[PDB]
């Protein structure tokens, strides 16, 4: 093998040692671990969403699906950067992730949506944090990275804030 | 025969020697697309109805999904008159002669809520879509492999519009009794 | 003070004289306040609307605030082409205004927008009027252009009409 | 509470529950935000009407300029209106709101010379510049990592296109008093 | 000769009585006269221009040569369809053309560019009573495309307008 | 929960029977995992790489990986639409596949292409029996995606073959 | 030598045993040729078409050629894939071609256009039955190309078919 | 000199001291150019005149192609004016000068079949052809190798498009004497 | 036969006389040969190379395969325009070349692309000659094209020298 | 002389005092300095590079080589903007960068990229503490400019470093 | 190292002979050390122009250092094709250019512009010179580019002398 799960090396073309990479590489693969399955639950959802709001959600979480899987790209890139091993196996990502996901059966939109703005908030305050970790450890280019992302994941979920609010224009008339 | 006007006449079929297909085999599929043809351009005109009629809450969202519906099934409806018209045959072409010919429901001239409308659209996909697989066997058996795979790649486009319809039916939402 | 807002002085290189100028001027200007309102009120629900039919109200209030901006350019070029001065401040611009602009809080979705679709009536209405006076003082680019704007406004108000109609996919039980 | 009409409260900031940002920290920069907004609102207004009188020699090329930095100012003031609306304030709207609540120096209805006018806007930029790099340290400070973010990238559009006016206002050209 | 210059048989497919179409043909193919010379000058100025403002001009006048020709294609088309037959030699054009054509010397840019606007006033009004006598025939199609090209035509002599207004950036300290 | 892992309830709108969908339904489904872990490994790869033609591979696996996930979808699409529930959770993907995934380690680049075409074989032999299986079910469509899938996946899988076959540009000299 | 011509390794990335292979490499290669040889014969029928409908004839068959050199492409590197050794040069091309090709001389359009719809007709046969061999020899992926070739092929056909018609605008008046 | 109106001279050649080229050497070209630049203009607007009155079964493919050559005829006369203009002369411009300095032969105002008027412009494509290839060697010889290479470039265009003009007036069809 | 290969008829569209013309159609014919086989061996090569540094010489041969085409199509088509007859068939076109063609066996990517190279010499001198040809017989139209393609030829040419030489990333070490 | 080398005037309308201008203006005139030389290094080794990988690092160190210029580009312009004059003959620039730069000779492509790697490293040290200047100062544009280009660095940097790591496909069979 | 500056070792796969190229290379090399100082001059006056025409002058700088910078890969990279090595370190490319260049301190826009206008000769009659000397030696490839290129430069210098003309549209009354 040429590197082992787990391991550090840093990187000498990014004059970042192994003493301050680690730290990063620790914290971004808990991350690319808890989008990963936001990105399949997110299809997951993509998939199933039936009804009247139905075609706008299809389109509009798979959109969200595609902002996650670069995210992760992302993440995972600037791992094996840092001289790290980036979380691969399916296996692995839902293993390492810390977020909740759903079991293999079909909820209804508001119950599966309500479920993502969860895992969504959980990666926003992860990030948050790890963002100033990242430029404590004077690493600019990570936690510039991380913003660029944060702020994409952040609208996804106000996205899904704004679909689960309490307004429409069904009127109990028109039902 | 040295005598007449019509360059053609509805109803015969010539077959074709650039495409090495017989006027005996070439008619089968003549006869098998030709009806398809009647059934998507009234399919093309229900859908364009509901395009322009459809109101609501779900109103653009359906109106822009019923338009490109209409779209996919004019692409549909010329592919098929095409390959008639390759094939030796005759394509119907008037609109009067379109649903004469049509074996679907049309719905008369007055306006109904957008459920009533998708759900007889989603009736006139199914029949579409039933008799175009049937259709796909006659030309792969006929040795017709051009005309088979035509079908295939239209037939793919009509059934997910047609499984759009049915989720758009189905029964779940986002409103709530609390936002009513 | 290279012009005096009020004045009309006409233009020579459009053959157009202060006297015909000074009526579209007034015309024009009256409508430039209406639409910028307009403009304002369209970005304001476009960034509060909230509820199921958000996402697609929040792309739609976007294109229609983009459309007002634009008819609102072509009035303040078209008077300042006529020898006129444009209104600018947003103070002048509501001011010179005849139409309801609400006050700053925040109504449901069908509240605004019924407002909404309350003040493209009216510009509705005086713009078929000023397209008649204009091409009566033989005016007709400014009565072209106009009818092209008109054209434009005229659709998003049918297409709030559309919104606040008595219809919808949801169900009694899928509530 | 259960009996109110407006869903909102000019004045009011919930904070968010989905951007984990409770009230307490949200109202600071919604306060520092929507001062902002009005700022740059009422800037957007000033370039435009620099962008629809501007005359002269270098006419053209300032239309075209003035026009882009009005669009610029627009963007900023959507992103801020829509970072306020997001933690749970109520940004300005009406256009009197926006000129009352407004900070700068805006111009009275009359038309001023180009020179006049750009060093007027030049004014507003400054005033804008100064407090948006306050408001950036209020949020990182705050923990807010996403508002700071934006305001920098506003920030840095703000500072170009004000540099810009100020190199139009230069002493250097390449008119010469022969060619006068 | 499958046609003689001056001959306007007018449409059928059109359904437009040579009579009717006589009356347009002649106001067109005035039209077409004066604006290739028109097109002709700008391309003049076009190459020519020097100075400090000499690429912004250079730019302009490319520009508003190529909306001659547009337009100028847009009158010979027309013509031609209502059965007529469009002016075509350098030499019948200018001979037809009403305008002040520059003898073959070159002017500074002030001056030139004054003479164009001169062209275009004319043009201008010349079109403003053709569209009128297009309406009036009945012929909404004519009338309709010369709105169109007329919108563009004034826009172009009102920049050479803004071009020779009286205000600059220059100081006579920068001198 | 609107629907249940493992259930087929078929589809009215596609006139497709529970009985034979399920068939279909049973055999995409498996696919669908093994695509899907074939998509996070060809993503490991991706973003592992080394060596001298790193940058080559690094662009290949990535276009591949994206292969891999839109065949994946048009899986699951399908499956879904067939009244079935594809499969979701990183988990249960890994679980459902029947292919060889690498324990978290990084190999080198032969060992590793060398493993990802051990998984394009095993899915291009599932994939020829369950194009075979549908048109068999008169269920034409799904055939047809199937094929249009499976001639992607080849071609990628035949790319793979030919990084790995014995050639070279390099010679013992410049060693 | 790498690879000697006639030899068929077939393909063990692709899954595909040198037996089943060399049936369609056979195949493959025989209508590489023939296409090949439409491809020079159309060139050629681009470079010299003269006459009325010329210009819309050379860019016909500029198109037709370029078509016939993708199909080209494709079958070649079908080949290849498949463990094979495509056909290259010329003097192997026409050789190994069954199809009737001209001799040097030019001759009228409605000879070489029917020359042409007769090289069609053959590769458009033999293109039907392959297509059969391919998908009973289990090859799907070899099928699905060949259809698609296939429809490109026969339209290019059937235009040439209709050039050949017995119609036209042509009035023995207009003569 | 020092109280003329006209910044310059039609007949004058300044040359060029930013291009390095003598007002004796420039004037060579300039004397060149300046007369293919009325040709080519004078082609410009034959080529639109058949543009515009192309009648017959081959006419929209006329329409398009005559529509291009004016087209490139436009560019290529912009080319030399332009180059002319450098070489410090005053290139020909009002509609009465370009035909007067013109060479070759125009249409009466009257409209002939598209045999003779496409005949016509093939006779002007060739005066103008033969014109440049001489002014190519005269650029290439007096040095100016700039305005040489311009020259060729151009000069491949006009042959492509009255080659096509041959191709257009040559004996073959696909019209028989039966579909007649 | 409406032309008779090895007849060269002039062209009076373009002022040249068969004298001057049959010795560029001589020439031009000669490299269309050479051109188009070099076409028929990059296109093989293009097909079989494999390797490490496969992808990147597959895309290069394909492109350079592209340029010949397009450079053998302005002969033909110059040849043509002359008068001539330009050759046609793969037979003939391999019989008129005279550089030197692979037999139909595969040879390692070292090997083939020296072939090609000499290929590219041998057209590049022809060429280099036949402008001068071309610019002495008063033709600068076809000695104008001969260059620009010229230029073309040189930079693939040299690329392929630059495959060649004796250099790379590789070390002993990797190995 | 309008501006004096080494003055910095600050800027009233970036409310920017000489004082904290100053300082910044001297962190970013030396590494404009050091990014253009490392721009012409990039250039050097994008012009020379030869070898099996050549291709793929022509086209790499291309874009590397833009985007110091866009650095560069950046750097310079925001030291003019706060007042100062940015270093512009490539004499001055070389003096005042303090990197290593090659002698006119050329090395193996291995010599090269190492050596880049190097200047990488000092410009990335260099650059992460003057954003800290920046944010210190309260200059956040400068600052947020500088990790934006600093990402751009570390990127082109991290992947010289991949190309200099100990893999490849290459085996010494093949060899 | 791979290469001494000041050798010429030809090209075999140009048919370049060592003898010839070094005339080239000699010119070539000496141009391509006057374009880069050209390049980083109008660079310079790119970033400090100020006053009423900056903006204009702002983006045409920044083309022609664009055109600059591509004229001067183009050198380069012909001379690396003919066997040379190009000059690279700043250093090295203004001690071997032979224009004048300023000093690092910042002039008004007409010294400026004058200045450049002065490199732009120099470099215009030394590539003039240049062509002939490429189309003598039968480098007609070398002498095609130079054309090319030499097309640009004095399109760009005969702009600045545009620029520099006693023309304007302010008036002294504007003043
Ligand atoms: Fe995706
Ligand atoms: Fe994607
Ligand atoms: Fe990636
Ligand atoms: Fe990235
Ligand atoms: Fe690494
Ligand atoms: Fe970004
Ligand atoms: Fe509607
Ligand atoms: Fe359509
Ligand atoms: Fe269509
Ligand atoms: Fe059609
Ligand atoms: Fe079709
Ligand atoms: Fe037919
Ligand atoms: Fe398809
Ligand atoms: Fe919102
Ligand atoms: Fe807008
Ligand atoms: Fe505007
Ligand atoms: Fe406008
Ligand atoms: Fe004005
Ligand atoms: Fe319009
Ligand atoms: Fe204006
Ligand atoms: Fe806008
Ligand atoms: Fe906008
Ligand atoms: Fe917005
Ligand atoms: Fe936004
Ligand atoms: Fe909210
Ligand atoms: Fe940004
Ligand atoms: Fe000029
Ligand atoms: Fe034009
Ligand atoms: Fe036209
Ligand atoms: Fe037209
Ligand atoms: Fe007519
Ligand atoms: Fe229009
Ligand atoms: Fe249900
Ligand atoms: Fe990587
Ligand atoms: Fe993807
Ligand atoms: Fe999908
Ligand atoms: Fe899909
Ligand atoms: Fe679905
Ligand atoms: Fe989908
Ligand atoms: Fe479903
Ligand atoms: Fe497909
Ligand atoms: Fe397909
Ligand atoms: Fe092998
Ligand atoms: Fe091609
Ligand atoms: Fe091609
Ligand atoms: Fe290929
Ligand atoms: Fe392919
Ligand atoms: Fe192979
Ligand atoms: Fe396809
Ligand atoms: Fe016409
Ligand atoms: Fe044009
Ligand atoms: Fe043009
Ligand atoms: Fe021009
Ligand atoms: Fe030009
Ligand atoms: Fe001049
Ligand atoms: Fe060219
Ligand atoms: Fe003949
Ligand atoms: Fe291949
Ligand atoms: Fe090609
Ligand atoms: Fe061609
Ligand atoms: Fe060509
Ligand atoms: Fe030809
Ligand atoms: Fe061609
Ligand atoms: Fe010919
Ligand atoms: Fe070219
Ligand atoms: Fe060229
Ligand atoms: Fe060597
Ligand atoms: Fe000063
Ligand atoms: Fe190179
Ligand atoms: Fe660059
Ligand atoms: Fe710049
Ligand atoms: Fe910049
Ligand atoms: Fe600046
Ligand atoms: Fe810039
Ligand atoms: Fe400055
Ligand atoms: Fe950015
Ligand atoms: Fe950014
Ligand atoms: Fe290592
Ligand atoms: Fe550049
Ligand atoms: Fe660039
Ligand atoms: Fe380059
Ligand atoms: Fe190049
Ligand atoms: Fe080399
Ligand atoms: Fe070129
Ligand atoms: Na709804
Ligand atoms: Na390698
Ligand atoms: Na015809
Ligand atoms: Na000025």
Not at 128 to 139: F, Q, V
Not at 147 to 167: P, S, W
Request: aromatic fraction near 4%; glycine fraction near 6%.
């Amino acid at each position: 093998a040429r590197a082992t799960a787990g391991e550090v090396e840093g990187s000498d073309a990014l004059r970042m040692d192994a003493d301050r990479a680690e730290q990063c590489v620790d914290a971004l693969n808990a991350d690319l671990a808890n989008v990963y399955v936001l990105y399949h639950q997110l299809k997951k959802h993509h998939w199933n969403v039936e009804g009247a709001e139905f075609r706008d959600l299809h389109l509009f979480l798979g959109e969200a699906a595609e902002t996650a899987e670069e995210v992760a790209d992302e993440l995972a890139e600037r791992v094996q950067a840092l001289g790290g091993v980036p979380h691969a196996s399916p296996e692995t990502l839902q293993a390492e992730a810390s977020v909740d996901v759903e079991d293999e059966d079909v909820y209804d939109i508001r119950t599966s949506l309500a479920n993502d703005m969860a895992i969504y908030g959980d990666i926003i305050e992860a990030t948050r944090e790890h963002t100033e970790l990242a430029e404590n450890l004077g690493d600019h280019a990570t936690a510039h990275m991380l913003r660029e992302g944060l702020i994409e994941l952040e609208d996804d979920a106000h996205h899904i804030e704004h679909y689960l609010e309490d307004d429409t224009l069904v009127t109990q008339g028109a039902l």
